[PDB]
Design a protein around this ligand. Structure first.
Ligand SMILES: C[C@H]1O[C@H](O[C@H]2[C@H](O)[C@@H](O)[C@@H](O[C@H]3[C@H](O)[C@@H](O)[C@@H](O)O[C@@H]3CO)O[C@@H]2CO)[C@H](O)[C@@H](O)[C@@H]1N[C@H]1C=C(CO)[C@@H](O)[C@H](O)[C@H]1O
Length: 476
């Protein structure tokens, strides 16, 4: 009697490329590419387990642009330059980026603490600030290859910085290749999402928000987004087809967001299985066990992630020592295994790149111990999405209706329902009436609405510039 364990690591960035200048106004795609997007699948080179991944099409587009040498990344240019060539504005951006990241364990260099205590930085201090920002985002693979430069911690030269940059771009250039490799080796399945990571249930029917939050105010949706919802899914199938050579049959719904109408759309577009959140299941059925494969109206298979386990990795275990965290996680799997007489399917589904910066050593001791342990546990079998979808010795249940929501409290309030978020929807609605090109799809991404109207969101001015620039460009 096995426990079936399914990891599904979701990878996404919104489009940081400003459409009029072509400039990447934030470096987050570059930094998560060199830290996470190659290294997370590359664990499969060292550990005999299965791991699955979601890649959004808009993330893939940007990874490609960086790999081809065509991304004009303004923050990265401030890092690359000799400090004597830095603009006043660039020194400020560097310092402010450091301030934002200063307390994360991956930034634990005493030299960074020194540099932020200084009133004015000379050329050598700015080289250290530049290079330590780079090295803070070093991924597992190059953490081994560049170990000696990392331990130096100070006194970096321009040549050493450029060496690190070149190795980082080598990692980016091999990123799509490693997803193709682990896929064709059967070591993991790769899914995608609707193209720009929108909230499909809202695009199909904004009234679905009242299924969970009847008191919310939303703007006047005087235009239909139903066709755009279909386009996000169809364009995502095409982008995935181009990269991996087949149409995707697994999709991760952005923000775990489902509704009865969204599930119908995914079915109509040929998607065979998706996953969503345990809160949705609890809101939708009485006996809400996440350890079964569900069939929505006999149309499409649905797994509900184990929210506790997913949240322990995503939010809890950074505050734990690595050995104790793995002990805790394995202990919880043992409890699940002996809590049922059938073989439970245990989906662990979360962002694949955002939690690690808060762990010691970028989460590498944790994942190395976790994967080493799982590799050898005889009562656990990790599965690909394909194996989970087609496995015969599991329990199943039919579901006729879901209550529309997301994995954030089972509702849509993180993206709609206050004056500032509603203003973005109003802007989008107005622009859609006059839209002439697919930049309107870019502006439908969930990310713009998440950062709008929030207390101190970092660089929200940049997200705002991007959203409004895409909305402007969509009408031209
Ligand atoms: C400002 C923020 O930008 C970057 O964050 C991006 C994430 O890295 C991406 O993975 C993507 O996240 C979305 C997920 O895919 C989705 O599943 C859901 O979880 O929503 C996410 C938000 O839409 O897109 C993000 C940008 O939209 C950057 O990587 C990240 O570090 C930056 N976070 C800063 C913000 C705050 C306050 O919230 C601090 O807590 C962080 O420490 C800062 O680094």
């Amino acid at each position: 009697k096995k426990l079936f364990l399914v990891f599904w690591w979701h990878m996404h960035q919104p489009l940081y490329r400003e459409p009029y200048t072509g400039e990447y106004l934030l470096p987050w795609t570059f930094f998560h590419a060199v830290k996470d997007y190659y290294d997370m699948p590359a664990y499969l080179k060292d550990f005999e387990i299965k791991l699955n991944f979601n890649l959004t099409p808009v993330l893939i587009d940007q990874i490609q642009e960086y790999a081809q040498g065509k991304a004009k990344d303004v923050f990265l240019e401030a890092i690359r330059k000799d400090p004597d060539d830095l603009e006043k504005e660039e020194v400020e951006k560097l310092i402010e980026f450091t301030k934002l990241n200063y307390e994360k364990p991956i930034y634990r260099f005493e030299r960074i603490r020194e540099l932020m205590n200084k009133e004015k930085l000379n050329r050598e201090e700015l080289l250290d600030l530049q290079t330590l920002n780079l090295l803070a985002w070093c991924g597992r693979t190059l953490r081994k290859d560049l170990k000696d430069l990392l331990n130096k911690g100070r006194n970096y030269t321009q040549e050493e910085k450029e060496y690190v940059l070149n190795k980082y771009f080598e990692i980016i250039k091999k990123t799509l290749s490693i997803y193709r490799e682990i896929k064709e080796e059967g070591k993991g399945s790769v899914s995608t999402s609707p193209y720009y990571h929108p909230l499909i249930p809202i695009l199909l029917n904004p009234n679905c928000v009242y299924e969970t939050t009847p008191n919310v105010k939303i703007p006047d949706f005087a235009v239909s987004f139903r066709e755009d919802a279909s386009k996000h899914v169809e364009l995502a199938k095409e982008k995935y087809f181009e990269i991996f050579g087949e149409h995707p049959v697994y999709m991760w719904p952005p923000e775990a967001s489902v509704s009865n109408e969204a599930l119908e759309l995914y079915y109509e577009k040929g998607i065979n299985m998706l996953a969503t959140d345990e809160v949705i299941l609890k809101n939708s059925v009485e006996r809400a066990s996440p350890y079964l494969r569900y069939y929505f109206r006999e149309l499409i298979s649905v797994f509900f992630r184990d929210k506790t386990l997913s949240d322990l990795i995503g939010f809890s275990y950074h505050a734990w020592n690595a050995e104790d965290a793995v002990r805790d996680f394995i202990g919880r799997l043992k409890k699940i295994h002996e809590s049922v007489d059938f073989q439970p399917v245990v989906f662990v589904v979360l962002d694949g790149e955002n939690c690690w910066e808060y762990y010691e050593e970028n989460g590498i001791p944790f994942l190395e111990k976790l994967y080493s342990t799982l590799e050898k546990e005889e009562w656990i079998e990790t599965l690909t999405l394909e194996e989970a979808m087609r496995k015969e010795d599991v329990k199943t249940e039919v579901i006729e209706s879901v209550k529309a929501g997301t994995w954030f409290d089972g509702n849509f309030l993180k993206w709609i329902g206050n004056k500032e978020k509603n203003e973005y929807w109003k802007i989008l609605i107005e622009a859609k009436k006059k839209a002439k090109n697919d930049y309107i799809l870019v502006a439908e991404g969930s990310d713009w609405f998440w950062w709008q109207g929030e207390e101190k969101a970092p660089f929200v001015e940049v997200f705002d510039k991007l959203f409004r620039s895409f909305v402007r460009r969509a009408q031209e």
